[PDB]
Paper text:
The lysosomal enzyme β-[name] (GALC, also known as β-[name]; glycosyl hydrolase family 59) is essential for the normal catabolism and recycling of galactosphingolipids. GALC catalyzes the removal of the terminal galactose moiety from substrates including galactosylceramide, the principal lipid component of myelin, and psychosine, a cytotoxic metabolite. Krabbe disease (also known as globoid cell leukodystrophy) is a rare, inherited autosomal recessive disorder caused by loss of GALC function, leading to devastating and ultimately fatal neurodegeneration. Removal of the galactosyl moieties by GALC occurs via a retaining two-step glycosidic bond hydrolysis reaction.
Of the aza/iminosugars tested, [name] and nortropane DGN are the weakest inhibitors. Only lactam IGL and [name] possess a functional group on the ring corresponding to C2 of the substrate and in both these structures this group is able to form additional hydrogen bonds with N181 and E258. Despite these additional interactions [name] and IGL do not confer greater global stabilization than pyrrolidine DIL. 3 twisted-boat conformation allows [name] to form a hydrogen bond with the nucleophile E258. 3 twisted-boat conformation is favoured by 14 kcal mol–1 over the chair conformation for [name]. Due to the position of the nitrogen in [name] and the orientation of DIL in the active site neither of these molecules can form direct hydrogen bonds with E182 in the active site. Our data also identifies that it is not only charge but also the position of this charge in the active site that is crucial for stabilization of GALC. Both pyrrolidine DIL and [name] possess a positive charge on the heterocyclic nitrogen at pH 4.6 but neither of these molecules confers equivalent stabilization as IGF and AGF. Thus position of the ring nitrogen directly adjacent to the negatively charged catalytic residues is critically important for achieving the tightest binding, and the maximum possible stabilization effect.
Residue numbers in the entry: 25 to 415, 420 to 668
Write the structure that this text describes.
Amino acid sequence: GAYVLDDSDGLGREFDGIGAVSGGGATSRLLVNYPEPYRSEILDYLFKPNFGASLHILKVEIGGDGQTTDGTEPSHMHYELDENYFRGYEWWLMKEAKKRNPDIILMGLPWSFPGWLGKGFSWPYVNLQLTAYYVVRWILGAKHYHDLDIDYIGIWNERPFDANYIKELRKMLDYQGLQRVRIIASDNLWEPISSSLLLDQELWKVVDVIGAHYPGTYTVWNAKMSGKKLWSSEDFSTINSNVGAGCWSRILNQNYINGNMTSTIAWNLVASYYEELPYGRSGLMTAQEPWSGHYVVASPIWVSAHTTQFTQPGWYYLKTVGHLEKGGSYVALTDGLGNLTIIIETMSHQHSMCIRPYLPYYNVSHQLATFTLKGSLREIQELQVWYTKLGRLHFKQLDTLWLLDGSGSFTLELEEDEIFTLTTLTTGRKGSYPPPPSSKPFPTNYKDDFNVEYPLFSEAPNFADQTGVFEYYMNNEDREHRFTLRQVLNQRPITWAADASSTISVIGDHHWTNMTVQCDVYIETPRSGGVFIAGRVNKGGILIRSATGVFFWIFANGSYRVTADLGGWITYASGHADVTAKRWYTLTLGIKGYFAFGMLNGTILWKNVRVKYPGHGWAAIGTHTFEFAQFDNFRVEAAR
Ligand SMILES: *[C@@H]1O[C@H](CO)[C@@H](O[C@@H]2O[C@H](CO)[C@@H](O)[C@H](O)[C@H]2NC(C)=O)[C@H](O)[C@H]1NC(C)=O
Ligand SMILES: *[C@@H]1O[C@H](CO)[C@@H](O[C@@H]2O[C@H](CO)[C@@H](O)[C@H](O)[C@H]2NC(C)=O)[C@H](O)[C@H]1NC(C)=O
Ligand SMILES: *[C@@H]1O[C@H](CO)[C@@H](O[C@@H]2O[C@H](CO)[C@@H](O)[C@H](O)[C@H]2NC(C)=O)[C@H](O)[C@H]1NC(C)=O
Ligand SMILES: *[C@@H]1O[C@H](CO)[C@@H](O)[C@H](O)[C@H]1NC(C)=O
Ligand SMILES: OC[C@H]1NC[C@H](O)[C@@H](O)[C@H]1O
Ligand SMILES: [Ca+2]
């Protein structure tokens, strides 16, 4: 029937913005080595105002050297007394976002922590001041080295919080002159953080926002009672097809309507990680081919636009929002300056399923909606119209709708899976760049000598660490190996995921079946040290311990092994080898069909060793444990 949109009796909650997550883990990994102009174009679709997704909020992982879903991300403090604010790519990403949108909101949250913070235990709450010290340094560094103001700081992603830690974090922030930084907790469930705020006055005072993960558009009573801002601080996480776009469309509206949540943040920002890693293509768009330059501006980009391009942090929701009688919902916002945005969604059940949670079936059918602008909204002679149809027309602008009647009323015919945005704002724009190059597989012949003296990023391109951390390394005394790739962790992190017991970095095409991998390796630890190269590595990320394939190990005690698994439980071959520490060797591993061979300095070590087939996966390098080791002159030839 009719839906009243009124101002006169007051407003709803302040709108805080829409955002996305870069990190948890290494989700932006393959974006950094995109050639220009494509890399810059992708960033525009994400962050440029009145263009693409036009995001209000960017949330990033504070790397802790641990595996955090699709890879590891480097910490600013690998060891005690170590400080480096130029590792990884989150600094760069934040700067790129701020250049396009100076008003963008920045958040930081740790998934994992370096092992040395635990002081013997794998626990970040052993020394509260130390862990807070670590986190605050990251915030200080963002300002001092990159001119970044971090707006919000979290606790420990989907992990228990410590009330004394949060209080210490607040005290530490203030002590370092960061009074303006706000705290969000606890990036998990609504409980126990919500009840803890009601029971503890001192905890209530230091927490600014309650952020919950995948709330299914609902909150809980204690959260409402707190009087705190409530955010869906992580949501979405669905493959960016039309379905995922429908999911994203529905929850953007109904998170506030059903749960009073004034912000929603998607995991993840962009799918710049190998698709065969966990939750592949679960970003707002896709950019997983830096070698070709191909990127896909997926449907969720324009779903975001329907809200972001016509709302800003600081607008207020109207009291008058709700569901449509025949399915779907509507929200309305104002800036308090006479502008009005109305967002309408009619996502069907079959085309809006999220992975978390899965809604019981609900009906959606054709309907008419009549809207009447009461209060100070009674005015507004014209409204711009933007339309999207999923399943396929995206963010197309329709003809201005006029209210010269005086009734302050208008009517729409709605159908399944549609978005309408009705706004007084005239700045809307479907941004566009020419189509990027076509999809191409990872180069069947590939090499890297790691010879870069002033690298822009701390790690060689396309190498996605899945346990441990690999960096560019300059050794000035050695001439033949002055520039190498080095694994730099010397102890297991305070882990978020189940990191492997061995370090590993994967690269290439997961489809590869027959391949030849070569690399120069260097074992830094006497007697006990070990390294490997591998092919047909089929699992990574959160499942990195599950990785099977063909692994060629050599050890400083004068031995080698060939295993079917990263964990080394299953032996293909083993024996002795002329191998010691602090010496450069060239490993070659060849795999074809049922058989594999291995070479040491160009000489056959083992041949015709039967391996399981069929099987496919990436190539990789790594170390036996968390130990220093160097790699150089990497090459791979493969058949897909
Ligand atoms: C949170 O939002 C809910 C809406 O789901 C508010 O609860 C009531 O919602 C019904 C219809 O959904 C309205 O008729 C009531 O007027 C709402 N309550 C009140 C007190 O107005 C709830 O109030 C909101 N909580 C806040 C804003 O703290
Ligand atoms: C709706 O659009 C914008 C909201 O920011 C307003 O336009 C700005 O208004 C301020 C003062 O009100 C000026 O200083 C800016 O130069 C304006 N910018 C632009 C791009 O116009 C506008 O006033 C709002 N209200 C209406 C009725 O349009
Ligand atoms: C990888 O190597 C295997 C083994 O050499 C290939 O499988 C053979 O394919 C030929 C056809 O060209 C058959 O005649 C053989 O009988 C197959 N051998 C086995 C053991 O199946 C396979 O085609 C190669 N794959 C790629 C992508 O190069
Ligand atoms: C859904 O609603 C439509 C319209 O009222 C009705 O025709 C249809 O039978 C319903 N189907 C289900 C499964 O509820
Ligand atoms: O859905 C998975 C997704 N959500 C949970 C974690 O916070 C993320 O890193 C990621 O694993
Ligand atoms: Ca080199």
